[PDB]
Design a protein around this ligand. Structure first.
Ligand SMILES: COc1ccc(N(C)C(=O)[C@H](Cc2ccccc2)NC(=O)CN2CCN(S(=O)(=O)c3ccc(N)cc3)CC2=O)cc1
Ligand SMILES: COc1ccc(N(C)C(=O)[C@H](Cc2ccccc2)NC(=O)CN2CCN(S(=O)(=O)c3ccc(N)cc3)CC2=O)cc1
Ligand SMILES: COc1ccc(N(C)C(=O)[C@H](Cc2ccccc2)NC(=O)CN2CCN(S(=O)(=O)c3ccc(N)cc3)CC2=O)cc1
Ligand SMILES: COc1ccc(N(C)C(=O)[C@H](Cc2ccccc2)NC(=O)CN2CCN(S(=O)(=O)c3ccc(N)cc3)CC2=O)cc1
Ligand SMILES: COc1ccc(N(C)C(=O)[C@H](Cc2ccccc2)NC(=O)CN2CCN(S(=O)(=O)c3ccc(N)cc3)CC2=O)cc1
Ligand SMILES: COc1ccc(N(C)C(=O)[C@H](Cc2ccccc2)NC(=O)CN2CCN(S(=O)(=O)c3ccc(N)cc3)CC2=O)cc1
Lengths: 206, 200, 201, 203, 205, 199
């Protein structure tokens, strides 16, 4: 990454943390924030390093390459560029993705005045592709998350919003009630409209 | 976090510590202090990062969002130049940038948007702890062969979960007879150490 | 904590220290050697830090209530001896319940320093010693050598003695088994411990 | 390594990380990036240290030595050396490979004005040889990766691109090797289907 | 401990150092190789730090009392050999950290010229630890003999491990040959005076 | 050790534990020797002795190492006989020199690298020990009838590495199905070629 504005080597802890997150959690949605936090201050070279250290899930990694190329093409459309000697150049899509730019070029853009934040732009493209992958690898739809006959209400709400988080990559208490089991459904409808989640779960912890 | 005043990337150790305390302890009450310690100096962005790295307990996290919106609404209710004042959603990091948060937290006078957001978050977490307390204090009663120490442990762990923001009278009433008589005979004003020694 | 431009600043408590403390409590309960570890882990701690460390303990809530009791006793005695734009800290200020972090830093870094962190740590360790003594599973009088290596018996004797006092070798000889008791009596009164264990191995 | 420019001792964490990734992953392709990251800023001495701490896989390390000598010979051809009281010398292949150069000489080149990145050049040679080894230890060819009659399309694409990565140390071959249930669907999708689209089709 | 940064400052002892010491005592007890680790873990230690490390040991309380005995003996001899706003002169119990404050220890350790109370206390502690190492040696060098099928190298390992424990206090080859089994003993005897250890081990391999 | 921020620094718990672990887990396999050198980066002689002394086992090896050290110290005294003084063998080995003296030598201008010299002696002795504890001779590494060529080459060069503390013996000791292929390859064949052919 880069820090203070000086480039810093990616740490063995950060590298291992990421590889382990991917090994342990695959593309569950909570992997996306960790990546963003682990890639705090990352140059594009560092981001490519992090992606490449993942050994498995190579289908997902190919899809990710596709999404990155879609964003790079849209970048070339939105901010077309032409260089003068002794002066730096403006980055195009393949430059933000680190395939045609050097480390020094990335550092120059990221620490220039005004700064051109190629690391954040690349990270946004990467998270866009990751969100697509998380949504795709979601095992079941939100319409199919229904409370079982003896399933504790808390566990059902856990499943409901975990699925919603994967599928949103809103505040559907109506589907939540509709998909609750009959006893809980009767109680929740009698609770009234505008009931918060705490109220719904307290009403149904029996 | 903002440290000594420059911004620092959230550390892998902190991230892992938080994820692990949630994985290993769920919402036992001692998880809230750890969050506060792990989020020392956190910007709102950092706090959102820590919350989002939690993979389970999404019911609790929705409840937490609800509480946060209640606190943000009260902030806007009570606290309504080219080159701005923070609203509720700004302190919660949903409508503010990192740079804006740094500006508020690092200023004279400082505007502690990180501490304000953390306070709202801890209010909601305490609520969640209260919800996940399996038994009320009225049901914490000493067993017939249960050591007094173990009963007091359970009693105050439950009391702590139910009071997430003379406790030795209910304690005596709920103690088993063999120990209740001794405690009653100790008299008024006995400390906990004295009560526990008497029933050792 | 408060750590030393070469001057003292406030630092966030580290995940390693927090985890070390939580782990030591999980693994060792209130064995006496938990108190040294705490003192080292709370090196330079503000009262806020000390309360943070205590609050991360999840179990043993009886002991922690007992600890609060001891803290209130020490805070009352502080108020008795030191009655009272920076202000002098009272008992509840040293215990971190009515003082802010900035107030604690100000007291701790004044010239001359008012060591509210060390004083609070002293109260906390006083209460912890009470808990260690109370939770000692055996009295020293019941530690007697079996028909058991002298070294193991002395280990038990002084581990129990350490818990119970939170110290005489006469009891050590009295409670030893006769095989070693004859040797110890013949050794001469005034024998060191090395001489006793070296003698009857 | 050289760090923001000073010399730093190689860290125990980096040494252990490298030894562990080699023990756990052998020469799977994702070992080469890790090496590059663990050797960020490494001098040639540091690179040799990391390589030498590997205890097994001595066939691969001898092959790597062969590749290093091949690159050193090409360096000497295209960047000849001529034979400076107090002044500094031009690096040959074996100096960049750390076999005839001292630590201070490596520091001098890497920290010169203009800098001569002998560490990056040596690292490039090392990664060329490692890629050759990864290719050698690849267990299957891309021609032999075919979808099973009950294999989820996602798992087959995983195997396909993992093998492709080891070999290149595509959608047409991907469809051709798919099972008929999936092949018919993919063919009906029409040309130009993206991977996301294809995988959704055969989900 | 005390460590340079441009001025010698006190730094809090780290959780890593504390854990390393407690774990090595738990895992290795008082085998001779624990004493170097302590010295390394107590690099730059003040007497307070050394006492902290010692006090974190939960077991082996017999050994810790024995250690206390040695420390008091050294402190009394210190008071003999160096009879005792400005800095006071340190006595035995000051170097042992029982009657001196942390600030006093820093003053002595950082005075010009320095009075190294931390190194002196560490020396007393290692002397006592060496006594404990000798006591907890399970067997004497006279009782280490190779069995009829024990590889010579393993036997020499046992022999010198015992020698290291027993000689932890302030000619190795002859007993080594004498206690070897006849099979290797004959070879070594035929080798000649002045055989190196490598030569002996090769001869019996 | 002695590093630049040029002061003495306390040895870190990571280095101590790393060394003890690599010795416990790998004994004197050759790849321990680089690890030691890397773990002792910037070490004073005192530090090197610390690392050696923390090893609890292998006391035969440690005496053998001591033997090699005394031979090197004697050769130093013969080559380089003797305010600031010149270091002798026992000074470089840390038995008669203080820490402050070692720092003076290591940080003088010009530097007297007592740490590098002592490390050289220690690694020389370690190489002898590594060679001795190699279980089999290179002449005895022969390809099995059903043994994959890659595994045989792995063993061959691991043994060669333990014995050096290339083409003809490798082919000669291969099994005949692979030996015939290798012989037909001709001279000058690289290892990569030999291994792809026999896969
Ligand atoms: C004022 O409140 C706020 C405060 C901060 C944030 N900020 C900026 C975040 O970054 C939050 C951090 C956060 C995380 C947990 C609890 C509280 C807060 N991040 C998410 O909340 C991610 N997240 C979003 C997808 N899903 S969902 O199931 O699709 C979903 C379900 C219901 C609804 N109504 C919408 C989405 C849930 C989830 O945990 C957001 C809101
Ligand atoms: C003077 O003594 C003090 C010193 C410091 C504090 N400070 C600031 C804290 O931060 C304390 C830390 C603490 C922890 C253990 C021992 C001592 C101290 N911690 C809480 O104050 C929160 N806390 C308070 C009770 N609860 S309870 O069981 O609900 C409960 C039980 C009985 C009653 N009557 C009411 C509530 C558990 C808990 O986590 C507080 C008191
Ligand atoms: C001898 O010179 C000195 C030097 C330093 C100290 N200082 C300041 C300490 O901090 C010592 C450090 C220490 C620790 C272990 C071994 C040696 C030394 N440690 C304690 O003082 C705590 N401590 C006290 C309770 N018990 S005990 O079993 O009840 C016990 C039973 C009988 C007797 N006579 C004493 C104690 C043992 C213990 O480890 C003290 C004395
Ligand atoms: C899309 O935007 C970019 C951004 C950055 C990169 N950069 C510079 C890399 O470095 C990529 C990082 C990377 C990783 C995942 C997603 C996106 C990016 N990292 C590699 O390792 C490339 N890479 C991946 C294996 N393959 S392949 O499987 O043989 C292979 C597969 C398909 C085809 N058509 C050909 C070969 C070899 C290879 O060169 C590349 C693309
Ligand atoms: C020039 O050579 C030297 C170089 C350096 C040292 N220095 C200062 C040390 O620190 C050495 C370090 C060391 C450790 C292991 C291998 C090599 C080196 N370590 C000890 O000197 C302590 N040490 C001493 C003997 N014992 S022994 O087995 O009792 C023993 C065995 C045989 C005989 N004849 C006597 C005693 C084991 C031990 O750990 C010493 C001598
Ligand atoms: C090729 O260009 C170079 C580049 C760098 C180096 N430098 C300075 C080293 O430090 C090398 C680093 C190194 C290590 C592995 C692969 C590549 C590189 N390290 C060793 O050379 C140690 N080493 C020692 C001999 N043995 S061997 O198996 O006994 C053996 C080897 C060769 C023959 N002909 C016979 C036996 C294995 C080994 O890895 C040397 C050469």
């Amino acid at each position: 990454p880069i820090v203070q504005m000086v480039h810093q080597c990616i740490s063995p802890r950060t590298l291992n943390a990421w590889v382990k997150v991917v090994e342990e959690k695959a593309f569950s949605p909570e992997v996306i924030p960790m990546f963003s936090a682990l890639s705090c201050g990352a140059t594009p070279q560092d981001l490519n390093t992090m992606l490449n250290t993942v050994g498995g899930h190579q289908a997902a990694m190919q899809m990710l390459k596709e999404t990155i190329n879609e964003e790079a093409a849209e970048w070339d459309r939105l901010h077309p560029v032409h260089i003068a000697p002794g002066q730096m150049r403006e980055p195009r899509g393949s430059d933000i993705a680190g395939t045609t730019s050097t480390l020094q070029e990335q550092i120059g853009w990221m620490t220039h005045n005004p700064p051109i934040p190629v690391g954040e732009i690349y990270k946004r493209w990467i998270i866009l592709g990751l969100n697509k992958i998380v949504r795709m690898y979601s095992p079941t739809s939100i319409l199919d998350i229904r409370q079982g006959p003896k399933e504790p209400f808390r566990d059902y709400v856990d499943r409901f919003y975990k699925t919603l988080r994967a599928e949103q990559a809103a505040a559907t208490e109506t589907l939540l009630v509709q998909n609750a089991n009959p006893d809980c459904k009767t109680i929740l409808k009698a609770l009234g409209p505008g009931a918060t989640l705490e109220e719904m779960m307290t009403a149904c912890q029996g």
